[PDB]
Design an enzyme around this catalytic site. Sequence first.
Site, PDB file in Angstrom:
ATOM      1  N   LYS A  49      12.512 -12.072   8.020  1.00  0.00           N
ATOM      2  CA  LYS A  49      13.091 -11.128   8.979  1.00  0.00           C
ATOM      3  C   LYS A  49      12.685 -11.455  10.422  1.00  0.00           C
ATOM      4  O   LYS A  49      13.386 -11.036  11.352  1.00  0.00           O
ATOM      5  CB  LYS A  49      12.648  -9.690   8.632  1.00  0.00           C
ATOM      6  N   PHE A  90       0.484 -17.348   5.690  1.00  0.00           N
ATOM      7  CA  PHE A  90      -0.748 -17.750   5.024  1.00  0.00           C
ATOM      8  C   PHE A  90      -1.216 -16.656   4.019  1.00  0.00           C
ATOM      9  O   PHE A  90      -1.588 -17.003   2.893  1.00  0.00           O
ATOM     10  CB  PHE A  90      -1.825 -18.115   6.086  1.00  0.00           C
ATOM     11  N   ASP A  95      -1.130 -14.248  -1.576  1.00  0.00           N
ATOM     12  CA  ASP A  95      -0.740 -13.014  -2.255  1.00  0.00           C
ATOM     13  C   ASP A  95       0.169 -13.274  -3.485  1.00  0.00           C
ATOM     14  O   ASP A  95      -0.025 -12.645  -4.524  1.00  0.00           O
ATOM     15  CB  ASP A  95      -0.026 -12.075  -1.269  1.00  0.00           C
ATOM     16  N   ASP A  99      -0.852 -12.103  -7.061  1.00  0.00           N
ATOM     17  CA  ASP A  99       0.059 -11.113  -7.628  1.00  0.00           C
ATOM     18  C   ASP A  99       0.935 -11.732  -8.705  1.00  0.00           C
ATOM     19  O   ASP A  99       1.683 -11.004  -9.356  1.00  0.00           O
ATOM     20  CB  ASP A  99       0.900 -10.460  -6.524  1.00  0.00           C
ATOM     21  N   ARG A 104       9.925 -15.232  -3.409  1.00  0.00           N
ATOM     22  CA  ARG A 104       9.667 -14.775  -2.042  1.00  0.00           C
ATOM     23  C   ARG A 104      10.763 -15.352  -1.140  1.00  0.00           C
ATOM     24  O   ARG A 104      11.044 -16.551  -1.216  1.00  0.00           O
ATOM     25  CB  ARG A 104       8.268 -15.228  -1.593  1.00  0.00           C
ATOM     26  N   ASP A 166      -7.032  -3.772  -2.862  1.00  0.00           N
ATOM     27  CA  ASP A 166      -5.789  -3.862  -3.631  1.00  0.00           C
ATOM     28  C   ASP A 166      -6.079  -4.441  -5.043  1.00  0.00           C
ATOM     29  O   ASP A 166      -5.672  -3.862  -6.057  1.00  0.00           O
ATOM     30  CB  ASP A 166      -4.743  -4.725  -2.877  1.00  0.00           C
ATOM     31  N   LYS A 192      -4.752  -3.634   4.113  1.00  0.00           N
ATOM     32  CA  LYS A 192      -3.937  -4.769   3.662  1.00  0.00           C
ATOM     33  C   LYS A 192      -2.657  -5.003   4.474  1.00  0.00           C
ATOM     34  O   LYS A 192      -2.209  -6.153   4.502  1.00  0.00           O
ATOM     35  CB  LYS A 192      -3.609  -4.721   2.148  1.00  0.00           C
ATOM     36  N   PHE A 231       5.493   1.606   6.101  1.00  0.00           N
ATOM     37  CA  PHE A 231       6.057   0.303   5.767  1.00  0.00           C
ATOM     38  C   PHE A 231       5.573  -0.168   4.399  1.00  0.00           C
ATOM     39  O   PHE A 231       6.371  -0.736   3.660  1.00  0.00           O
ATOM     40  CB  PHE A 231       5.744  -0.738   6.844  1.00  0.00           C
ATOM     41  N   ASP A 235       7.705  -0.723   0.923  1.00  0.00           N
ATOM     42  CA  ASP A 235       7.535  -1.980   0.177  1.00  0.00           C
ATOM     43  C   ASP A 235       7.278  -1.689  -1.316  1.00  0.00           C
ATOM     44  O   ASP A 235       7.818  -2.389  -2.182  1.00  0.00           O
ATOM     45  CB  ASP A 235       6.381  -2.812   0.777  1.00  0.00           C
ATOM     46  N   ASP A 236       6.468  -0.644  -1.611  1.00  0.00           N
ATOM     47  CA  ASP A 236       6.169  -0.236  -2.989  1.00  0.00           C
ATOM     48  C   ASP A 236       7.417   0.362  -3.659  1.00  0.00           C
ATOM     49  O   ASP A 236       7.681   0.064  -4.818  1.00  0.00           O
ATOM     50  CB  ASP A 236       4.997   0.761  -3.053  1.00  0.00           C
TER      51      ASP A 236
HETATM   52  O1  LIG Z   1       2.989  -5.539  -2.303  1.00  0.00           O
HETATM   53  P1  LIG Z   1       2.043  -6.524  -1.610  1.00  0.00           P
HETATM   54  O2  LIG Z   1       0.871  -5.744  -0.912  1.00  0.00           O
HETATM   55  O3  LIG Z   1       1.521  -7.454  -2.650  1.00  0.00           O
HETATM   56  C1  LIG Z   1       3.119  -7.349  -0.330  1.00  0.00           C
HETATM   57  O4  LIG Z   1       3.613  -6.260   0.453  1.00  0.00           O
HETATM   58  C2  LIG Z   1       2.357  -8.357   0.530  1.00  0.00           C
HETATM   59  N1  LIG Z   1       1.220  -7.871   1.295  1.00  0.00           N
HETATM   60  C3  LIG Z   1      -0.060  -8.323   1.161  1.00  0.00           C
HETATM   61  C4  LIG Z   1      -0.840  -7.576   2.010  1.00  0.00           C
HETATM   62  N2  LIG Z   1      -0.017  -6.695   2.604  1.00  0.00           N
HETATM   63  C5  LIG Z   1       1.231  -6.891   2.177  1.00  0.00           C
HETATM   64  P2  LIG Z   1       4.523  -8.164  -1.145  1.00  0.00           P
HETATM   65  O5  LIG Z   1       5.364  -7.088  -1.884  1.00  0.00           O
HETATM   66  O6  LIG Z   1       5.307  -8.871  -0.102  1.00  0.00           O
HETATM   67  O7  LIG Z   1       4.061  -9.195  -2.154  1.00  0.00           O
HETATM   68 MG   LIG Z   2       2.452  -9.319  -3.414  1.00  0.00          MG
HETATM   69 MG   LIG Z   3      -0.523  -8.227  -3.161  1.00  0.00          MG
HETATM   70 MG   LIG Z   4       4.985  -5.171  -2.787  1.00  0.00          MG
END
Ligand SMILES: O=P(O)(O)C(O)(Cn1ccnc1)P(=O)(O)O
Ligand SMILES: [Mg+2]
Ligand SMILES: [Mg+2]
Ligand SMILES: [Mg+2]
Lengths: 342, 342
Positions: A49, A90, A95, A99, A104, A166, A192, A231, A235-236
């Site tokens: 983005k 990075f 991540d 994860d 991505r 996390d 995070k 934000f 994302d969640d």
């Molecule tokens: O959900 P995450 O925190 O793992 C993520 O938001 C990345 N991230 C890592 C730290 N803050 C954000 P993404 O869904 O992009 O994999």
């Molecule tokens: Mg992630």
């Molecule tokens: Mg993560």
């Molecule tokens: Mg996420």
Amino acid sequence: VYAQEKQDFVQHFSQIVRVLTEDEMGHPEIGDAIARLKEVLEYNAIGGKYNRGLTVVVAFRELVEPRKQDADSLQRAWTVGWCVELLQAFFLVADDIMDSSLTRRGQICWYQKPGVGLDAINDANLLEACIYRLLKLYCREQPYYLNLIELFLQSSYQTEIGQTLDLLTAPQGNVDLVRFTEKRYKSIVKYKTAFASFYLPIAAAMYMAGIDGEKEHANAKKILLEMGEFFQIQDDYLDLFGDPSVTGKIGTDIQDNKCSWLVVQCLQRATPEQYQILKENYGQKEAEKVARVKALYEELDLPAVFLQYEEDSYSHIMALIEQYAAPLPPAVFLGLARKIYK
Amino acid sequence: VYAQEKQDFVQHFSQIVRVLTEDEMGHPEIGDAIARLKEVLEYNAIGGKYNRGLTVVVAFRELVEPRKQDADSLQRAWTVGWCVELLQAFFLVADDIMDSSLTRRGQICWYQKPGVGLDAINDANLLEACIYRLLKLYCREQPYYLNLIELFLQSSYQTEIGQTLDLLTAPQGNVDLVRFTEKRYKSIVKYKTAFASFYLPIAAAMYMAGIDGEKEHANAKKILLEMGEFFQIQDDYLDLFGDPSVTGKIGTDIQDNKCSWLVVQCLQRATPEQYQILKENYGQKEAEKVARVKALYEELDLPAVFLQYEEDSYSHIMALIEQYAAPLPPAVFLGLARKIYK
Ligand SMILES: O=P(O)(O)C(O)(Cn1ccnc1)P(=O)(O)O
Ligand SMILES: [Mg+2]
Ligand SMILES: [Mg+2]
Ligand SMILES: [Mg+2]
Ligand SMILES: O=P(O)(O)C(O)(Cn1ccnc1)P(=O)(O)O
Ligand SMILES: [Mg+2]
Ligand SMILES: [Mg+2]
Ligand SMILES: [Mg+2]
């Protein structure tokens, strides 16, 4: 118009790569390493983005007097913007491994690529090195040089503390429902995401504009940290309810036993019966069990609870802009809020 | 006597941990993350030789006038020494994953620990954050502050370029004998080890003593980079021929298709017949095949070739000390050379 400011910033990525890979002009021995760096940058800093790096440029133009916005000052603004893009790149390369993600930005994760694998750990470290390499090449003789170095270093540590929180709240093979609270959740996302995705870009532009006062940064932080909390919640939500063709990434939060906003809201609304359904199906790779959790979230009308949260959060962020934007142009925070709230 | 300077430096690790974990005194939300940080430090920065960090302390005492060696100046010297120890710790945590190693410093690798795994990627990033956290807490108001920050940042990038070169020359499942040259080998080790293990500690002490001149650092580099080349060659020898009870780590170089000094020397002495034996047995997990390579190295009297190299290299480093040590005390480089050559 917003896509025009985007395109100018994107057109500068070629020079960012050119200056980061000109180390082989004098040292041809490290050539293959330099070629691999170009490959890592091209794969992981492009296709997004660019909203984080673009925020640096937009905030610079709104905080610096046009009389002081010369060609060199502008190049430093897009370069620092691209440093914010490298910090995210990075942290995301790392991540996706931690994860155990699949995709991505529309393509498979850098580490899932044949021939890359765990070599991506060093690729992520190289992306981090480029932040400080660019800061040296373009801001070394500026009064805000050390402020930028310290802001990127501090932002990295805050993200890392957040990433630790996390991962500790999400142990694979362990029921952590007890620990999935709103208080815990708020602490995780503050570190995070909220610092490096929201505070870092505006604060970088503030330091570049000569605004270094602790009170001004503290007031900016009040708005941006709350913006970052929303934000991450978004994302969640989109991890489970988003379209991977839009998001460009496949959700892993249920499988990864993550402290998602969705599961925190689930535990606040679930009957004793619904608590056990979640307990038996959460944190497991089984597609059948992941589906059972998505069904329970839909039964407790969580996509509706999210729509209500987004409305309430937008009004909240807006209230904070009216309280803490001064003496900065309200457009600085308003611009980003419009771009974040869909 | 050398163990006494060691013990004083080691006794300071408790305070290093105390100041790095005092962030929960004000922010109890990040408590669990802080507890995990203490665990990472305790496991990965203790149990080694401490020769890298100790070099900072020894070089400080030899370069600073005792009249200027106050309590605060000394605390800054052991703290920067411990920053060098954190740089190595963070790079080794990552290296053990990418090299798929079993043990480090007498115990199983941090990532091989039940419950850690790939979460160690973030643990390594946290170790890196502590360098800059300590530099801020103790050197923030010193004239060499930025020089230290830039030296640790540059040393990290040089190691990362080196690690990239190490991993690109060693693809799993590919015969890279053609690429295993002396010229390639010299480039890999210059970046992956010689800068951060030898140049970084002496240069840090030089900056802390006020010696910031490019000519003085260039002359120091001439000695220390060559010292680093020998140290890596010794590490490659001991990977196969060392005692894991002494080294504290199990060799993986043959299994990992690595550009070791041993295989470079093998290719320089091997008959066409011996070249094919190496080709068919190198880079494979099979214990039978690893054993066949060790047998070929012993047939070409490589442990004897190493003993001759060590003698020739010690005379070479000694020649360079006589040429480039001035105006620094020869003891600075002599002290480290005695500690490196066994
Ligand atoms: O959900 P995450 O925190 O793992 C993520 O938001 C990345 N991230 C890592 C730290 N803050 C954000 P993404 O869904 O992009 O994999
Ligand atoms: Mg992630
Ligand atoms: Mg993560
Ligand atoms: Mg996420
Ligand atoms: O042999 P490597 O280069 O992998 C090693 O020497 C570590 N290292 C990594 C970069 N420089 C040195 P170690 O044998 O300790 O695993
Ligand atoms: Mg190794
Ligand atoms: Mg290695
Ligand atoms: Mg080795």
